[PDB]
Structure formats: structure tokens, C-alpha cells
Write a protein that binds this ligand. Structure first.
Ligand SMILES: C[C@@H](Oc1ccc2c(-c3ccc(F)cc3Cl)cc(=O)oc2c1)C(=O)N1CCC[C@@H](C(=O)O)C1
Length: 911
């Protein structure tokens, strides 16, 4: 522990340029006997590297002498620091050769230094300059070409033979550079102030007095915190000079201004009900570390190098700019060259405790303290009352939460990508994050390249808020709200608070396009990085966003737009595309009326399943048909396509079950079939039978079973393992339209889930067999004291963070990974073909013009994925990994009789 603290102290001294203090502390440690043993060659080499970077040959020799006196041998790091100092000071070739001869006598090699010692570009250049003075013919081995994956699936994707026509952003190179500069400035600021979208009364009797007194209190708090920080820093300086270890360099690492500003921001964002003391200390320490990381990237020239590289990388995305050879964003970034350590837990904890105690001490108000000990730091009732009376309209958000205004950095590695100056991991999950990351690092780099390119593609998409829909939603939200349409009205209080955050951000991004960086989960489902964009399934959010880039509708663009409007309305679900288009043409008068006068009129859209999306589609088709040439009209609206229960689709594809394929519409058919309606009829029959037998739940739950509840139950059974969209949402859907007593809603939901599960088991034989096999395999692997692990068809390793839950989650997780691989393949092929494709909550969004091409690519990639021996490869991997278990793994479910190629002909596969 103490050795770790000392190592962290020396590393922080190196980062802060406090080599005098580091040297003093090391000399004290060496002079004191019992403390000499606590030192380590790592700390010696850290101090040596610091003195070398600063150019102190005398001090470097002194540290080497101390090392030799401590019975320690010089290592590659010490020799690297020595050579760096020699090259920096232009030392003599004689001394250089003597040092190299000593190093060779010690048994170390010169070529192994550049490979085993971690050094920056400047240090490497200085060491090479020093070496060349004695060995001018010493050149490091030339870098090899980057490796490209050649998987049976990604072969056509990464093949140079296949022709490509990737898309190009509409913004010009200069505007892209300007937006990059804006994003860089905002991320350096680290905080953004947005105007609230709540009607301001602006009174003077109470609000102005509250605001003025709060300003006075803020000034007092700031000028007290400054004094407290200065006193603490002086105390720590004296403590270190005395000999004992402290957090002086850690405090000096961040500017006093930044420290006090972050403290005040945390105090302002403190919840009224209160927050835990340990949580506050952890937050303070993590914030200090992150701000230190960003300011270090700034001062160390890393920001300048990133800007220099980005100005060139934007040539690929910019339309006017043309690169020599077309290639993926990650490939271009790696070709141009990508520029290149968490603190100890106890150090972070002590720093957080110190900062929190300093805050609690310097916080005084008319003088009584502000934070009290209830370890729960609850604010002052008077303070929260004053803040409420003030009601500052501005709201503060983190630079990472706000969507980026420039193309996200391509995902070059699990760590490098997405945000600019902020480190972003590939997997969002914090449970087992260490396991996920170590597995992703262990598996071959070429394996993850597919997923990284897929994420880069999904991220490199421009978005903008729809002005009309945003204005309408704001008018409804401010005018007492409209729960019917989904707009909250002033539980509900939390929903209103959240909606205020999202709508406020929407107003901020009214006239500026943004980009959404995407990360993954342990299952493989992609999710936007910003936490405010989590609620993407809402019709409000779905109608607000639109692709900033718009393409010509083309010949079938208007037909596809009308079909999408009909699907959103949901009035004609069983009808085919021709009859849907006929109905769209029939309700053309109401569509135009809705597009012209939404608020005042027939409100036809209001009588739709998704009112906001229906209204947006009405506006779009109106603007399209009102122009001279409807095909010439440019569309910016995302058209969504989904497969009825992708989980059951994948199950049927794996089982080759003809009945299941016909039910989930895998086989060609002129009319679409609703597996939801089939399961609804089955569960209704089961309810009737159980009611005749004598079950009160079945007797009372008569007729209320509807397509919506059946869809939710199927999603929970096929895609649900206590996750978002499960039994809780089933209960919510039931209550929302519940005319029966709510006392047994929980039991009714349980019974419905059970009956739907049994009905699915009875109907889908292949699904039943595959689910039973996976369940038994997971159960046995858990009984053997191991966690279930596998590899997706693409190559991404997947592990379960749960530490039976594994038994119940293995089949859903496998199906999720299959769907994610299918989506990644479809997205990669669309990007190769020059299409704008995104995945938003199991619904593929594209443009109205390229819907046919997207569906074709989806069918082709689905057949390609399910043509490989997925189950056989899974069984072989499981056996090789965990080796009665082997017997069950070998007993792969028998495949049925079904020509999977027929999927290519199915026109209702995705609708
Ligand atoms: C009421 C509902 O309006 C919205 C509005 C906007 C968003 C956005 C968003 C943010 C910025 C921007 F520029 C464009 C958009 Cl689109 C993203 C998002 O992800 O969500 C939104 C929701 C709302 O805030 N909700 C939260 C509580 C649960 C939800 C539900 O109905 O269950 C509803």
C-alpha cells in the first residue's frame, strides 16, 4: 500500500514537474534506513526519467549512484532515461559509448529498450539522437503493414476487389473544421449552460431578491474555498518538505480556479434530498482525475497533435475534399497515424475526502454551515428554499453528455475512439467491465476490427431536431402538458424533470447538426453514449430527430413514405404493401389537413398509435407532394424497418422449422402473417381452457388480451431477462388500459407470461429445442463453477457479468448477440454500398429512397449469417473452453427441413 502511494506520488511529481520535491523525498527515503527498503527501482527510474526530461545530468548521475548504493541494478528504463538526458544535453560520444557498453555488460539489449520501455515521441527522438552519435547505422525495425481480418463473413467487407462507394458528409471541410474547433472548446470548458424551456414569470418581489442573495452567498463561498485550498496546499507543502508523504502534487496538479469551480458546481448540483458522503468524495476524486486528464492532453501538445491529425482525417468525410484511395474511417486514421493509468484507489479516496471536507468547512451561510451530517450530506433547508425561489433558468450539463458537433473519432481500439479528449470505453457495462476489457484485449485485434468499424459507422451519422415538432411539443409541455400525446404535465414529477432536460437540450441543438457516438454492451447491443439519449423508443424522441443529410426520394420514395406512414398509424397491419398504399392515398385529405393545421383541425394524427411520428410523416408527405416534382423533393426523415420478433426469427432460422418460418414470415407470402396474433389466439384458447378448469386469473382476464400485450409478453419471453422491456413494462401496459381491478395485476402478468411461454414452446419446435439445449448447457457450465462465455459469429467475445441467472440469460444473450451481428453485417454492407443506416431500438432506420436496398442487404446478410454452422461452432467453442457437460454440448439440436435461401425472396421479411 505505502509502496503504491509512493509510486503514485513520484508519477504525479513527474506529471507536475516537481522534480525538486521528488528528489528531496527520495533522498530522505534513502537516508532513513527503515524507509530505504520501501523504495523501489520503479520509483528510482521515475525520478531518473523526470530529471532526464528536465535535462539534469548531474542529478541523473546522483540518482544512479543512489540506486547502486541501494543494491539495485540499472534497468532498461534507467538506461533510457540516461540516454534521453545525454541526447538532450548533447553529451559526448565517448560517454554515450561508455553507457552503452555498461548496459551491454549488464546483459540488456539496445533493440529491446524501444520495445519494452514506454516513452513519448519526444523522448524516443532524443534517445535516438543520443544513440546515433555512436551508432549512426542503428535504425529501429520498420513498421509492418496493418493486419486486415479475412473472416468468411467480413471477407467481402474488407476485400479490396469488391467495388465501394462510401457516403460523404454534406458539410464542407472548412465547416467541419469549424465545428471541430467548437467541440474542442466546449470539451475543454467541460460544462455547458442551456436555457430551460420553462415559461419564466420574471417577478421582482421574491425572485430577484433570492437571486441577488444567492449571488452574494456564491461569492462568499468562492472566496472562502480559495483561502481553504491555499492553506491546505501550504500545509501539504510543509508536510512534504518535512519528509512525510502527502497530496501536495495532486493538489497542485489542477489549477486552484478549476478546483474551486468544480467544487461550486458539485455543490450546486447537489440533490435537495441529499447525497452520501462517500459517493460525494468518489465523485470529487473522479472529477479531479478526469479534468486533470483533459488539461494534461491540452498542455502536453496532445490537443495540438489531435487537431493536426483531425484536419487531415476530415478530408475523407468532407464532400469537397477527396482522399487518394477510399477506405474506412478507422483505416484512414490508422494510416495517417493515431497519437498515443488510473490513480490508486486509496489516493483517490483520500483526495476525495480532503476535497469534500474542505467544501463542508468553507461552506458558510447566514454563519451556520451548509452541509450537515444526517454519512449523508443533506443541504440546508433554507438553502434549497432559496435556490427554488431563485429558479435559475440555466441548466448545466457535462461536455460528454451533450452530443458532439463534429465527426466522432474512429474506434481504433477498445480505448481510442468516440470523444476527443475524454477516454471512452467500448463497453458501457460497469459490472464486469474489467473482465470484458481484458477479454477484448486478449482476443486477436483483427477480431474486434469488425465491431469497431460497425460502431464507427453507426456513430458517423448527422442528426438534427425537427423544428416544427419541437415547437409543438414545447407548446404542449408549457401549456399544462398533454399526457394523451405523451407530453408530461405538471412519478409524473420525475417524468417532467427528465423531459425538461431532454427538451432543453433539444432547443440547444435546434439549428446545429450533431453526431451520436455509440458504445456496446456485453450482449452486443449498441447504445448511444450520451445518457440523455437513453429514451429513444419514445415517439416524441423518434419524431424529434431527423437525418441532417437528406436524399432525393426517387421513384419509390413517395410510396415508401406512404407505406411507413400507414405502418405508423397501424390501422392496416395485416394488409399488404399495395393495400397499405391504397389506404394512404385514400386518407390523403386527412393527411394534408394534419400537415397544414395540426393543432386546430380534425386531429387525424391524434387517432394514431404513434401520434408524433404520424404527424411528422404527414408533414413530410405533404411537403413532398406539394412540390413540382415529388421525386425531386429531398427527404430528411428516417424510415424504420423491423422484423416481427427478431428473436423468434433467429430461432426459426437456427432450427430450420417450416412452421416457425411461416409464422414469423420467414417464408415468402403475399400477405404478412402476425406471429403476435397467432400467439394471441393461442393464449386466448389457453385462457378459456384454464377458466373452464377453474382459474380466477383466466376467468377475469377475459377479452383484455390484445396484440399490444401479447407483443410485450413475447418480447419479454424472447428478448427479456429482467431487462428493459420485460414484466414491469408488461404490467405498465396492462395498467394503462386496465378496466379490471388492479389488485392482481402482478399475478395476471405472471400468468400471461407463463401462458405465452408455454404457447411459444408448443408452437415453435425449433425454438423449444434450441432454448432447452442452451438452458441445459448454461445450467451445467454454472454447476461446474464457471461463467458462460462464447464468441459471436463476427468474432467479438461475449461473457456474462452475472455472478439460475446464467441459465435464464444465456439464450436471450445469445439471441441478442446474433441480432447484433446481423445488424453489424447489414450496416457494413450498406456503408459499402453508400447508404445511411442506423440501429435504434431493434428498428433499422434509413432513408425513404434506399429502403429497398436496405431490405435486400438485410435479407442477404441474414441468410449469410444463418448459413454458417452457428450452433456447431458454439458447441465446439464451449467444449474447447470448459473441457456430462461434453455430452450435452455434442447433442446439438437437429436442424429441420427448410431452404433458407427462400428468405431472399421474402418481401415482407422486414416491414
Ligand atoms: C417526453 C419525452 O420527450 C423527449 C424529448 C427529447 C428526447 C431526446 C433528444 C435530446 C436532444 C435532442 F437534440 C433531440 C432529442 Cl430527440 C432524446 C431521448 O432519448 O429522449 C427524448 C425524449 C421524454 O423526455 N421522456 C423521458 C422519460 C421516459 C420517456 C417515456 O415516454 O418512457 C419520455
Amino acid at each position: 500500500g505505502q509502496q503504491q502511494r509512493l509510486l503514485a506520488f513520484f508519477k504525479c511529481c513527474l506529471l507536475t514537474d516537481q522534480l525538486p520535491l521528488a528528489h528531496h523525498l527520495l533522498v530522505v527515503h534513502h537516508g532513513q534506513r527503515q524507509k530505504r527498503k520501501l523504495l523501489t527501482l520503479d520509483m528510482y527510474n521515475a525520478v531518473m526519467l523526470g530529471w532526464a526530461r528536465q535535462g539534469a545530468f548531474k542529478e541523473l548521475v546522483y540518482v544512479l549512484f543512489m540506486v547502486k548504493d541501494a543494491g539495485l541494478t540499472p534497468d532498461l528504463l534507467s538506461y533510457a532515461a540516461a540516454l534521453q538526458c545525454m541526447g538532450r544535453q548533447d553529451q559526448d560520444a565517448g560517454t554515450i559509448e561508455r553507457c552503452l557498453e555498461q548496459m551491454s555488460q549488464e546483459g540488456l539489449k539496445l533493440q529491446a529498450l524501444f520495445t519494452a520501455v514506454l516513452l513519448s515521441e519526444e523522448d524516443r527522438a532524443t534517445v535516438l539522437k543520443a544513440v546515433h552519435k555512436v551508432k549512426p547505422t542503428f535504425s529501429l525495425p520498420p513498421q509492418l503493414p496493418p493486419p486486415v481480418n479475412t473472416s468468411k463473413l467480413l471477407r467481402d467487407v474488407y476485400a479490396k476487389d469488391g467495388r465501394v462507394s462510401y457516403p460523404k458528409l454534406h458539410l464542407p471541410l472548412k465547416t467541419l473544421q469549424c465545428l471541430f474547433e467548437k467541440q474542442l472548446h466546449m470539451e475543454l470548458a467541460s460544462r455547458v449552460c442551456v436555457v430551460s424551456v420553462e415559461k419564466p414569470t420574471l417577478p421582482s418581489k421574491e425572485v430577484k431578491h433570492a437571486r441577488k442573495t444567492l449571488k452574494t452567498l456564491r461569492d462568499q463561498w468562492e472566496k472562502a474555498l480559495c483561502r481553504a485550498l491555499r492553506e491546505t496546499k501550504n500545509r501539504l507543502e510543509r508536510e512534504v518538505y518535512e519528509g512525510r508523504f502527502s497530496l501536495y502534487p495532486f493538489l497542485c496538479l489542477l489549477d486552484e480556479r478549476e478546483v474551486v469551480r468544480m467544487l461550486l458546481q458539485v455543490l450546486q448540483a447537489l440533490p435537495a434530498q441529499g447525497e452520501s458522503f462517500t459517493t460525494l468524495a468518489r465523485e470529487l476524486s473522479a472529477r479531479t482525475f478526469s479534468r486533470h486528464v483533459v488539461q494534461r492532453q491540452r498542455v502536453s501538445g496532445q490537443v495540438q497533435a489531435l487537431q493536426n491529425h483531425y484536419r487531415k482525417y476530415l478530408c475523407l468525410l468532407a464532400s469537397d475534399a477527396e482522399v487518394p484511395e477510399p477506405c474506412l474511417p478507422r483505416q484512414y486514421w490508422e494510416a495517417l497515424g493515431a497519437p498515443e493509468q488510473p490513480w490508486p484507489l486509496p489516493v483517490q479516496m483520500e483526495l476525495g475526502k480532503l476535497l469534500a471536507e474542505m467544501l463542508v468547512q468553507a461552506t458558510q451561510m447566514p454563519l451556520v454551515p451548509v452541509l450537515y451530517h444526517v454519512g449523508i450530506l443533506k443541504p440546508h433547508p433554507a438553502y434549497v428554499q432559496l435556490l427554488e425561489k431563485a429558479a435559475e433558468p440555466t441548466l448545466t450539463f457535462e461536455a460528454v453528455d451533450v452530443p458532439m458537433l463534429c465527426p466522432p473519432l474512429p474506434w481504433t481500439s477498445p480505448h481510442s475512439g468516440a470523444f476527443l479528449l475524454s477516454p471512452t470505453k467500448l463497453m458501457r457495462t460497469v459490472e464486469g467491465a474489467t473482465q470484458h476489457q481484458e477479454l477484448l484485449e486478449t482476443c486477436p485485434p483483427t477480431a474486434l476490427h469488425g465491431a469497431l468499424d460497425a460502431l464507427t459507422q453507426l456513430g458517423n451519422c448527422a442528426w438534427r431536431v425537427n423544428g416544427r415538432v419541437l415547437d409543438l411539443v414545447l407548446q404542449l409541455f408549457q401549456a399544462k402538458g398533454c399526457p394523451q400525446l405523451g407530453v408530461p404535465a405538471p412519478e409524473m414529477h420525475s417524468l417532467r424533470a427528465e423531459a425538461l432536460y431532454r427538451l432543453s437540450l433539444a432547443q440547444h441543438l435546434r439549428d446545429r447538426v450533431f453526431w451520436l457516438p455509440h458504445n456496446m454492451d456485453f450482449r452486443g447491443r449498441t447504445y448511444p453514449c450520451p445518457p440523455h439519449f437513453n429514451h429513444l423508443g419514445s415517439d416524441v424522441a423518434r419524431a424529434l430527430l431527423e437525418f441532417a443529410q437528406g436524399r432525393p426520394l426517387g421513384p419509390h420514395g413517395l410510396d415508401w413514405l406512404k407505406i411507413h406512414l400507414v405502418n405508423l398509424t397501424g390501422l392496416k397491419k395485416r394488409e399488404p404493401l399495395r393495400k397499405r398504399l391504397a389506404f394512404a392515398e385514400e386518407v390523403m385529405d386527412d393527411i394534408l389537413d394534419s400537415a397544414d393545421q395540426p393543432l386546430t383541425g380534425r386531429k387525424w394524427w391524434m387517432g394514431a398509435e404513434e401520434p408524433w411520428q404520424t404527424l411528422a410523416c404527414c408533414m413530410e408527405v405533404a411537403n413532398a407532394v406539394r412540390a413540382s416534382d415529388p421525386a425531386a423533393y429531398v427527404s430528411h426523415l428516417p424510415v424504420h424497418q423491423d422484423g416481427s420478433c427478431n428473436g423468434l426469427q433467429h430461432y426459426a432460422a437456427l432450427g430450420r422449422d417450416s412452421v416457425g418460418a411461416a409464422s414469423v414470415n420467414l417464408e415468402p407470402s403475399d400477405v404478412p402473417q402476425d406471429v403476435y396474433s397467432g400467439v394471441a389466439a393461442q393464449v386466448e384458447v389457453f385462457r378459456r381452457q384454464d377458466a373452464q378448469r377453474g382459474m380466477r386469473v383466466a376467468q377475469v382476464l377475459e377479452g383484455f388480451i390484445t396484440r399490444k400485450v401479447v407483443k410485450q409478453t413475447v418480447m419479454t419471453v424472447v428478448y427479456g431477462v429482467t431487462r428493459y422491456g420485460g414484466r414491469l413494462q408488461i404490467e405498465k401496459r396492462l395498467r394503462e388500459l386496465s378496466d379490471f381491478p388492479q389488485e392482481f395485476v402482478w399475478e395476471a402478468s405472471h400468468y400471461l407470461v407463463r401462458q405465452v411461454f408455454k404457447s411459444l414452446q408448443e408452437m415453435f419446435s425449433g425454438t423449444r429445442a434450441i432454448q432447452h439445449w442452451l438452458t441445459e448447457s448454461a445450467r451445467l457450465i454454472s454447476h461446474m463453477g464457471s461463467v458462460v462465455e462464447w464468441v459471436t459469429p463476427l468474432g467479438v467475445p461475449v461473457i456474462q457479468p452475472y455472478r439460475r441467472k446464467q441459465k435464464n440469460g444465456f439464450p436471450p444473450n445469445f439471441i441478442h448477440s446474433l441480432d447484433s451481428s446481423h445488424m453489424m453485417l447489414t450496416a457494413l454492407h450498406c456503408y459499402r454500398k453508400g447508404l445511411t443506416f442506423v440501429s435504434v431500438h431493434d428498428c433499422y432506420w434509413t432513408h425513404a429512397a434506399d429502403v429497398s436496398v436496405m431490405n435486400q442487404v438485410c435479407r442477404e446478410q441474414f441468410v449469410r449469417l444463418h448459413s454458417e454452422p452457428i450452433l456447431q461452432d458454439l458447441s465446439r467453442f464451449l467444449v474447447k473452453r470448459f473441457c456430462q457437460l461434453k455430452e450435452t454440448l455434442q447433442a446439438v439440436p437437429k436442424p429441420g427441413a427448410f431452404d433458407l435461401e427462400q428468405v431472399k425472396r421474402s418481401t415482407y421479411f422486414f416491414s
